[PDB]
Design a binder for this molecule. Structure first.
Ligand code: FSI
Ligand code: CL
Length: 624
């Protein structure tokens, strides 16, 4: 939890009571565990929705949906049961409450089970299952001269009639919300991303939506891959971005422009960025994933545990910030090594909050954290993003002024700022490690075995912000060679392996004053000519499985070669700059590199020309 931030145990395990209703009697009843946080703002009233697991944290046990609500931003709360289970047996339950706010109404979608003791995807049929929608209406008033609120909950309505018996290629079984908070789309639709099972017990994600305030519901025709569960969605630039849990794998993210009729994996942005554990080989989690506007900029906030401990313990809840280009780790919201899986982040009246689980010995509480420090950090990073983008766009490029320098898809920028061991990203997301580097205006001068910079791709580890590069990228730099090498030496490239020996696309230079562009594992043909001490502009582009190399805005002879040989997707280890930064490699690159730009797409010819013409205008030197 950041400096300046603080929390309380709001839903306290084995302590907090809720109004348990049965057979017309209400009794204040202590709850064993609280799970499934959803934290929202309803027209000024903060509402926290959760599971009240009365007897045990076991998933398949007695559970009602609880709400707490506050009119004073969480200083005090009132408590109610929003949705009661069927009371059919000792384990009846309403589950995984998923919330949409529209106007002064909360729409809460829950599964309902009567008597099963088995995990939902293990059920061979829907004998025990229903899917219910309850609506809460929030009214504000002023008793005793003070602002008050109340929430009146409707009786739940089954949406089972809207679940078709078949979906292409399958027979349907059950579906549930993806927990947390869903959305109202820009056309007014209520949109729940849902997790669905078929009779083969496969799980997949769909979009489940309503055009008439929840009276009737439709499924979008498309779907995720099998294995994509518990989805969470937001709307971004006219599209749904649907962010899915995949147990034992990296999270898949999809886009859909047509209310889920067609799903496209978001390979160029967010898909496969977030891993569920260090080695992405453990269970995944529910995630908060929201679009908000902070100081005038639309951005997304994402949470997920790092899960160093493994299995479902899911320690180390982390918060991420992205503009759909750059991806910034705000940091750890939870405290120390506590277990902290499910979460919900709310941005209300320019204050940031998080309701999340803490788990000791499978006894769960929800803490309510005031993310004061995290908001400060987020505002700082966004100011940096805005400022660098403004600055680059403002430059009057050489013909009045030529086309603007493009900042669309500009993810990273290595320029003047460097510490002894790192070359700093101006966008503050991913620094490059360095060795044997000397600071120069807007870059670094390198020498010696082991020398260079490493800008990590898969080497980022669990969370891979530059995964897009496996699909398309542009890497740009200004270079000067200071000594003729003994053989062929590296200058810039994308490496498939950790050494740099196995390249996707690169540029080397040789003892005969020629360039050696490297296209995957294709035999290298030297070409062109360079002069010691002269500065050159280098662009490497990769898209559509094809790699190109440009010097001074022009493609080397024979460029435009296939670099992805066989339909496996690349797994780029890192970009290397100014050497390999590997003492295991015998090369000595004596070179200066300035102003390294990374984009998440293949730039066009105009954009490349503009960068070349503008290369002495773009550095960060005069600003820090
Ligand atoms: C979370 C959890 O991992 O801790 O998992 C849910 C599902 O297993 C997940 O959505 C994949 O289907 C549980 N839901 C149900 C209905 O079992 C959550 O309650 C929670 F358990
Ligand atoms: Cl099936």
């Amino acid at each position: 939890l950041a400096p300046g931030s603080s929390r309380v145990e709001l839903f306290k395990r084995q302590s907090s009571k809720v109004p348990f209703e049965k057979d017309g009697k209400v009794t204040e009843r202590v709850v064993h565990s609280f799970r499934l946080p959803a934290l929202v703002n309803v027209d000024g009233v903060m509402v926290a929705i959760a599971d009240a697991r009365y007897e045990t944290s076991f998933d398949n046990s007695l559970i009602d949906t609880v709400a707490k609500y506050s009119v004073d931003d969480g200083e005090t709360w009132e408590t109610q049961i929003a949705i009661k289970n069927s009371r059919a047996s000792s384990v009846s339950r309403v589950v995984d409450p998923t919330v949409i706010v529209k106007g002064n109404k909360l729409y809460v979608l829950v599964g309902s089970y009567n008597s099963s003791r088995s995990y939902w995807t293990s059920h061979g049929d829907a004998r025990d299952w229903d899917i219910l929608l309850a609506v809460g209406e929030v009214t504000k008033s002023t008793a005793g001269g003070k602002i008050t609120a109340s929430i009146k909950w409707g009786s739940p309505v089954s949406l089972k009639e809207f679940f078709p018996a078949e979906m292409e290629g399958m027979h349907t079984n059950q579906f549930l919300g993806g927990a947390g908070v869903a959305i109202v789309a820009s056309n007014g639709n209520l949109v729940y991303p849902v997790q669905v099972t078929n009779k083969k017990k496969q799980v997949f994600s769909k979009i489940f939506y309503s055009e008439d305030e929840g009276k009737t519901w439709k499924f979008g025709k498309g779907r995720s891959a099998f294995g994509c569960s518990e989805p969470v969605a937001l709307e971004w630039e006219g599209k749904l971005i649907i962010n899915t849990r995949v147990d034992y794998r990296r999270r898949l993210v999809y886009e859909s422009s047509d209310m889920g009729n067609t799903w496209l994996e978001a390979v160029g942005t967010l898909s496969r960025v977030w891993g569920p554990s260090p080695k992405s080989n453990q269970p995944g989690s529910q995630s908060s994933f929201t679009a908000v506007t902070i100081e005038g900029m639309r951005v997304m906030l994402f949470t997920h545990p790092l899960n160093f401990k493994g299995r479902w313990l899911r320690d180390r809840l982390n918060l991420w910030l992205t503009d759909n280009q750059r991806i910034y780790n705000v940091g750890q919201v939870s405290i120390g090594d506590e277990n902290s899986a499910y979460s919900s982040v709310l941005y209300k009246d320019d204050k940031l909050y998080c309701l999340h689980e803490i788990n000791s010995n499978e006894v769960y509480s929800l803490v309510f954290a005031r993310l004061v420090g995290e908001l400060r950090i987020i505002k700082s990073v966004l100011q940096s993003w805005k400022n660098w983008d403004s600055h680059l766009s403002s430059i009057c490029t050489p013909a009045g002024c030529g086309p603007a320098v493009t900042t669309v898809g500009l993810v990273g920028f290595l320029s003047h700022s460097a510490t002894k061991t790192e070359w700093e990203d101006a966008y503050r997301c991913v620094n490059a490690s360095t060795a044997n580097a000397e600071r120069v205006p807007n870059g670094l001068k390198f020498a010696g075995v082991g020398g260079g910079a490493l800008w990590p791709v898969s080497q980022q580890g669990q969370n891979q912000r530059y995964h897009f590069a496996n699909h398309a990228f542009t890497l740009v730099a200004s270079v000067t060679i200071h000594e003729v090498p003994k053989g062929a030496s590296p200058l810039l490239g994308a490496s498939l392996d950790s050494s740099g020996g196995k390249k996707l696309l690169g540029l080397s230079y040789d003892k005969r004053h020629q360039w050696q562009p490297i296209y995957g594992s294709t035999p290298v043909t030297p070409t062109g000519s360079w002069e010691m001490g002269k500065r050159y502009h280098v662009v490497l582009t990769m898209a559509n499985k094809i790699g190109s190399v440009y010097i001074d805005g022009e493609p080397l002879e024979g460029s435009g070669q296939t670099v992805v040989p066989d339909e496996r997707t690349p797994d780029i280890s890192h970009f290397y700059v100014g050497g390999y930064k590997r003492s295991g490699m015998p090369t000595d690159s004596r070179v200066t590199v300035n102003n390294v730009l990374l984009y998440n797409r293949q730039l066009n010819a105009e954009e490349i020309r503009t960068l070349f013409l503008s290369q002495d205008l773009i550095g960060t030197e005069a600003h820090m």
